[PDB]
Amino acid sequence: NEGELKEIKQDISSLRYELLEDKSQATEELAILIHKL
Amino acid sequence: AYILPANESFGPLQISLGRTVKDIFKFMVLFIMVFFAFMIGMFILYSYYLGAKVNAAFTTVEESFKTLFWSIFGLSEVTSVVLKYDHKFIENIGYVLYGIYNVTMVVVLLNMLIAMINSSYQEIEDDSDVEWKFARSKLWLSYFDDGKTLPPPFSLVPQPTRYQQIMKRLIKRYVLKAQVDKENDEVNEGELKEIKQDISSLRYELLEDKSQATEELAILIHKL
Amino acid sequence: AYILPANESFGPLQISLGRTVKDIFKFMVLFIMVFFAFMIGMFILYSYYLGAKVNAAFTTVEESFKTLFWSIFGLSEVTSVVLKYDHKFIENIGYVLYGIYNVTMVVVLLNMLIAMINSSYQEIEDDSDVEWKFARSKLWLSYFDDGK
Amino acid sequence: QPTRYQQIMKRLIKRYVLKAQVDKENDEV
Amino acid sequence: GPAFMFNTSLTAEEERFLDAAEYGNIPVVRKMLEESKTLNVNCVDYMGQNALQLAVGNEHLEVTELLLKKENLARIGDALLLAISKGYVRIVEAILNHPGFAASKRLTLSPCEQELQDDDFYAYDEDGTRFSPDITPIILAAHCQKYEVVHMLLMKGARIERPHDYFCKCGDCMEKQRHDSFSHSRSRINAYKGLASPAYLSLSSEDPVLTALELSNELAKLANIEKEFKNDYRKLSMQCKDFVVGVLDLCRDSEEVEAILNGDASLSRVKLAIKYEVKKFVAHPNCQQQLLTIWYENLSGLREQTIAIKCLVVLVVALGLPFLAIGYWIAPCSRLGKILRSPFMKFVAHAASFIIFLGLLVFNASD
Amino acid sequence: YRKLSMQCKDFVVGVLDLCRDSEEVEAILNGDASLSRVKLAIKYEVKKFVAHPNCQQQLLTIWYENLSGLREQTIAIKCLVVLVVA
Amino acid sequence: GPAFMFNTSLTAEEERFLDAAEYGNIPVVRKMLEES
Ligand SMILES: CC(C)CCC[C@@H](C)[C@H]1CC[C@H]2[C@@H]3CC=C4C[C@@H](OC(=O)CCC(=O)O)CC[C@]4(C)[C@H]3CC[C@]12C
Ligand SMILES: CC(C)CCC[C@@H](C)[C@H]1CC[C@H]2[C@@H]3CC=C4C[C@@H](OC(=O)CCC(=O)O)CC[C@]4(C)[C@H]3CC[C@]12C
Ligand SMILES: [Ca+2]
Ligand SMILES: [Ca+2]
Numbered sequence A: 001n002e003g004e005l006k007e008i009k010q011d012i013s014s015l016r017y018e019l020l021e022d023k024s025q026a027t028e029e030l031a032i033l034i035h036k037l
Numbered sequence B: 001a002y003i004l005p006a007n008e009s010f011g012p013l014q015i016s017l018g019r020t021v022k023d024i025f026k027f028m029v030l031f032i033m034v035f036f037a038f039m040i041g042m043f044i045l046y047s048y049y050l051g052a053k054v055n056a057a058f059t060t061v062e063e064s065f066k067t068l069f070w071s072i073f074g075l076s077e078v079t080s081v082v083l084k085y086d087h088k089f090i091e092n093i094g095y096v097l098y099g100i101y102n103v104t105m106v107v108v109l110l111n112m113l114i115a116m117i118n119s120s121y122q123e124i125e126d127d128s129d130v131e132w133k134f135a136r137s138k139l140w141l142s143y144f145d146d147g148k149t150l151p152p153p154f155s156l157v158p159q160p161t162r163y164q165q166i167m168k169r170l171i172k173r174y175v176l177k178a179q180v181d182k183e184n185d186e187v188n189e190g191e192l193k194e195i196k197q198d199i200s201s202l203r204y205e206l207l208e209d210k211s212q213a214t215e216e217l218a219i220l221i222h223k224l
Numbered sequence C: 001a002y003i004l005p006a007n008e009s010f011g012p013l014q015i016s017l018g019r020t021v022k023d024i025f026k027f028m029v030l031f032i033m034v035f036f037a038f039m040i041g042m043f044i045l046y047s048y049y050l051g052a053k054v055n056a057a058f059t060t061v062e063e064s065f066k067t068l069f070w071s072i073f074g075l076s077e078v079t080s081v082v083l084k085y086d087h088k089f090i091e092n093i094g095y096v097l098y099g100i101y102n103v104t105m106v107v108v109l110l111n112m113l114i115a116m117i118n119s120s121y122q123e124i125e126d127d128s129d130v131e132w133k134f135a136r137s138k139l140w141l142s143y144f145d146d147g148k
Numbered sequence D: 001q002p003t004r005y006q007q008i009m010k011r012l013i014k015r016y017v018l019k020a021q022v023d024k025e026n027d028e029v
Numbered sequence E: 001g002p003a004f005m006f007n008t009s010l011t012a013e014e015e016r017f018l019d020a021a022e023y024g025n026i027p028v029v030r031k032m033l034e035e036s037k038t039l040n041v042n043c044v045d046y047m048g049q050n051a052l053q054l055a056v057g058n059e060h061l062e063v064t065e066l067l068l069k070k071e072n073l074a075r076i077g078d079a080l081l082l083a084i085s086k087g088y089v090r091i092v093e094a095i096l097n098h099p100g101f102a103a104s105k106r107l108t109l110s111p112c113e114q115e116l117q118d119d120d121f122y123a124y125d126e127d128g129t130r131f132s133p134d135i136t137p138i139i140l141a142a143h144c145q146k147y148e149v150v151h152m153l154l155m156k157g158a159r160i161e162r163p164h165d166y167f168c169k170c171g172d173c174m175e176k177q178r179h180d181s182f183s184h185s186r187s188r189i190n191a192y193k194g195l196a197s198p199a200y201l202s203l204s205s206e207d208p209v210l211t212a213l214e215l216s217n218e219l220a221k222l223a224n225i226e227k228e229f230k231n232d233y234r235k236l237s238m239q240c241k242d243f244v245v246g247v248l249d250l251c252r253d254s255e256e257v258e259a260i261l262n263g264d265a266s267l268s269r270v271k272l273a274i275k276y277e278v279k280k281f282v283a284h285p286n287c288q289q290q291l292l293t294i295w296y297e298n299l300s301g302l303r304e305q306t307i308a309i310k311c312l313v314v315l316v317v318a319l320g321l322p323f324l325a326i327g328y329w330i331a332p333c334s335r336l337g338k339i340l341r342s343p344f345m346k347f348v349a350h351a352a353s354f355i356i357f358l359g360l361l362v363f364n365a366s367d
Numbered sequence F: 001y002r003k004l005s006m007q008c009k010d011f012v013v014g015v016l017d018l019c020r021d022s023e024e025v026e027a028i029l030n031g032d033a034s035l036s037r038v039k040l041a042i043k044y045e046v047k048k049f050v051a052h053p054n055c056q057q058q059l060l061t062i063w064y065e066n067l068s069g070l071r072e073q074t075i076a077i078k079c080l081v082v083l084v085v086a
Numbered sequence G: 001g002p003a004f005m006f007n008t009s010l011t012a013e014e015e016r017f018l019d020a021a022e023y024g025n026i027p028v029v030r031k032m033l034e035e036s
């Protein structure tokens, strides 16, 4: 159905928000590491 | 047949019977033009032979009408054509015209029978049930008014209101139901492309994000 | 026809034949009301003309029934209407009523034929096979008990 | 350089392709 | 090569940019919009679609948000219609927040007011608009039945035209009819295709069932008047017909069924449905069960009896009809009176009287 | 070949279906008002092209050239004028 | 605009939260439930 496909599209959408924030966590972690340096 | 629609067994039959009567009226008009063609043509041929025929079939317009009409049901003899005189040319023309009339009549009937079957084959998926119940409900409503009490033979002797709240409930219920029924449609090839593009954009964001980490670690080495 | 369902070739035919007989019973009832309408109407018209007609067609109720019934198969002549007297008004009414009866009869038959075809067109995808095998299996079960 | 008939045909053909590609997107996946 | 060119040579900086925008290469488009100075955002591909129309078509919200911030971006008007057509709600919200729509009254003004000024706003190429010129965003949302998009535009104040009568003599209708008489007739159907959609009927008017019933009659009459577009109006009439049935199908208790059938118990909407031949509304089980209880008002036990028993009471009424009529005159209001006033009994009384009449006709010629 | 013939038949109908004003309908029907493409469609039996509502409304206006009021009259009135003409 | 309102003005903190919850913006909803 068109509703099931929307379930998968939303699946990807939630995955995008988790991964992009996870990449953002690495960038800020490396930032404070530079400050300690 | 007026009170027939009220019955569940015979209701649908009387409704479908009325449908065919309306349907065949158009086809009957076409046969009338064919019927009038041979009525005038054969009357002209046999008008001069009043006392020179086996029977009085096509002599007058009324009798020409009677002979041709009852030929529909096979109740008119072939001796309608035969002449007493030796005018075989006129007699054989009457044989051909009367023969062509019967053949043409069968063609018109065959077309009528086929056309209605095609119409009914395109009127499927539980419409007769709806058609009868609508006709029955019209019968019910005619007796709901209090005026028609006795039969004709014996009748000679002389801020928001509750409706708005209910409509709000049903309309909101409709939209949610409508959007769910939209989700039951088959997925198009365009929608799938929307998801494929979704993944495609996600790939370009993640790969660049990984590239940002690599270059950030590179400048960290330079500071080291 | 009782032992016919047991055959594979003739089993489905006898089952479908029984289906149409049940189906046309409802349509036959409607034609009975039409048949009774013209039987009473034409008998009333021609009851007074006993010795003033070509034949005794519509004179009595029994003969009015016989004339109208056999008009279904085209076995009744048009002289059923003709009168010996010069009462052309009554004779022409009989011509019209007898003519309308035949036309109405064809309409009822045409509706019956069409309605069953529509019913059968909506009874497809291998139901006759199931219908016959169920009827055959009922025949088999009646002989399984040891008493008979 | 182009006449009015050519401009109209260009409009309708371009309109056809866009409509045709949309109707392709309505096929079952 | 091709006889018709819909877009020359599309220099590599632009061709790479169009490829990035179409396939949602978000890092590249952000890089090019910011750093690049030799690229214009209005370059088009082989189909005459600029960057914005490509990103909206593929549902690239992040790319669209980047492009909308770029000044002097073209085809913003059509990009909304493309997003509305495909039901991209998030993109529609993104576009409607652009200064082109927030500052202007484009959503509120009528299509005729939009058409009097050329303004090339909803044009999607050098000449022409993607959909019909008279299809405003609210009409397009109604056509596609995007409930959320219709609701968003209704909040903005957009309403469908509600065109004049077919036999109208006003200056505007006279001018349109004399001008084209085919664009005008097509314009009428487009307005009616939006007025008759369920997404607009339920979200716009106070009484959607009453509005749909009236609009169902209005579109059915137009089919006979304008025979060339008979199928177009006949289909639009059915959309209104099955909206009322759809609403009726959702009732879950007698109070809700009362509101739908009785309107605001005189079955006003049942009479309208019969008058307008909305057969599925009258024949629906929810409607039939309501009529059936009125049909057997005081005949509680007679509701569930067999046909043979109901044929027995018809015979009993036929035999006792002279006595029942006499009893009714003597005691108009009693146990006999309430039963005799029941709608089923009054039908039996009329059926029984006619049977007696057929008895007298036959019995008259019994000799 | 019969299937390939239909693909060409419904392309012309598909293009005709997209016209949105009289000027566009004129170009499709009259070709480059002699209805050249309507004659070709009848000659080549492209029935859906001739029977399309866009094509029919164009022929209908030519059919009632100067009979503006007679276009919307009922059949009974149009049968009356046939008797009057007779 | 619409005759029937099924929900006013949905202040930005809530409208952003509803957008995050609907489209599965997991980091945002965790942030808002905790800090806000
Ligand atoms: C057998 C002879 C002597 C007389 C035949 C006359 C019939 C043709 C008439 C007389 C009474 C009529 C009946 C009167 C009562 C009813 C019940 C009526 O409603 C029902 O079927 C009961 C359920 C409901 O009313 O909802 C439908 C018509 C029917 C069968 C009528 C059908 C036609 C009937 C049987
Ligand atoms: C030819 C004249 C002289 C007599 C014709 C009489 C027939 C009408 C009767 C007589 C015997 C009957 C048959 C007796 C045996 C069988 C086998 C019976 O079962 C089978 O077909 C075999 C397979 C199985 O039983 O499962 C089906 C009915 C049938 C054909 C009967 C069909 C009707 C028959 C042929
Ligand atoms: Ca879909
Ligand atoms: Ca996306």
Ligand SMILES: [Ca+2]
Pocket: B189, D027, D028, D029
């Ligand atoms: Ca596909």
Ligand SMILES: [Zn+2]
Pocket: E164, E165, E168, E169, E170, E171, E172, E173, E174
């Ligand atoms: Zn006007």
